[PDB]
Amino acid sequence: YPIKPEAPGEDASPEELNRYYASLRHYLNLVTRQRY
Structure with missing residues (x-):
């Protein structure tokens, strides 16, 4: 469970996603x- 990965919006697309x-x-x- 990642608390803060990156997360896009709703446009997504194969580049932003x-x-x-x-x-x-x-x-x-x-x-x-x-590790440091």
Whole structure:
């Protein structure tokens, strides 16, 4: 459960949704790796 990934609006589209997507993967990864 990501508290603050990125989150778009309602326009989404395969670029913004994909951006927030990998930002969620970024967020989720770093959230499990709080190493400095």
